[PDB]
């Protein structure tokens, strides 16, 4: 027979009837075609098993995955990789739009840090995209009163009332007259992409001396952070300056192309997480080279 799956995107919900033998590719190619999304390499189908994310493997049967099989079997369509330059790599309208929504939520949920002034400018493009051009006779004072435009973090940094925020965002909003939906969403993305925590996947690790650290895996390379500073890495390894990443048991080794440069090894305990890290290393490395 068939089994029903529910597919969750950033703004919609879909439901598909899958033959029992369907691999990830069957389901994934179908979702992308339905969306008219052509830059498929950025995206994947996500589910979460015991507080660790996992991605649908293409060459694997949907039901051989350890996703909860209680109907409907649910997957979240999300970007797994991020482009180095959004304006140039995101061509389809739906693609730009789903990145916009995935990134905006990261910011409002404070998963991606952004300075107060960046959050105000980002909000103004967000409202421009949703409400179109400004018109003071239609969008009367108080029309953004219940709209969620800023991270709670920035409003707890200022002696400012909500009306003061709304007044400030509206002024910047008015500055974007003439900008179409897609244009405002792309502008939002251009600002967001320069943020330090943008597009980076963080994993807690330990160096051989036993010191607890963070691994950052993003489009440009591997990064090592002190756990209290996710903004600025202590060490970076660009993808082109890396010879190989080997994995064994719970130990990673980063081997630089420059043989005189010491090797960097670290441990991670959870093996589900280590599999994820490798996919993210492999995929990001591939896209990095193919762009060059």
């Amino acid at each position: 027979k068939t089994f029903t799956v529910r597919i969750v995107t950033m703004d919609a919900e879909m439901e598909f009837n899958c033959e029992m033998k369907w691999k990830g590719k069957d389901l994934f190619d179908l979702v992308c075609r339905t969306l008219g999304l052509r830059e498929t390499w950025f995206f994947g189908l996500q589910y979460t098993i015991k507080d660790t994310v996992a991605w649908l493997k293409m060459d694997k049967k949907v039901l051989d995955h350890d996703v909860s099989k209680e109907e409907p079997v649910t997957f979240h369509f999300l970007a797994k990789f991020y482009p180095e330059n959004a304006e140039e790599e995101l061509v389809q309208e739906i693609t730009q739009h789903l990145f916009f929504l995935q990134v905006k939520k990261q910011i409002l949920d404070e998963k991606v840090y952004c300075p107060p002034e960046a959050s105000v400018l980002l909000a103004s493009y967000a409202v421009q995209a949703k409400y179109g051009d400004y018109d003071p006779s239609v969008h009367k004072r108080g029309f953004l009163a219940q709209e969620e435009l800023l991270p709670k973090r920035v409003i707890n940094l200022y002696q400012m009332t909500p009306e003061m925020w709304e007044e400030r965002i509206t002024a910047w909003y008015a500055e974007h007259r003439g900008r179409a939906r897609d244009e405002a969403e792309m502008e939002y993305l251009k600002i967001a992409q320069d943020l330090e925590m943008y597009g980076v996947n963080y994993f807690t690790i330990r160096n051989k001396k036993g010191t607890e650290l963070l691994l950052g895996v993003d489009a440009l390379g591997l990064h090592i952070y002190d756990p209290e500073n996710r903004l600025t890495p202590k060490i970076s390894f660009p993808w082109n300056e890396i010879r190989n990443i080997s994995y064994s048991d719970k130990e990673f080794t980063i081997k630089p192309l420059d043989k005189k440069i010491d090797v960097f090894k670290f441990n991670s305990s959870k093996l589900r997480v280590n599999k994820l890290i490798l996919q993210l290393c492999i995929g990001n490395h591939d896209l990095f080279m193919r762009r060059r």
Binding site: P115, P116, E117, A118, V120, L121, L157, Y158, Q159, M160, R168, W172, E175, K190, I191
Partner: peptide, 21 residues
């Protein structure tokens, strides 16, 4: 774009907000 650039706008926004803390 009357604010010129994003690089300028971010600074305009930061300094006009700076009097609150």
């Amino acid at each position: 774009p009357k604010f010129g650039t994003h690089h300028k706008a971010l600074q305009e926004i930061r300094n006009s907000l700076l009097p609150f803390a």
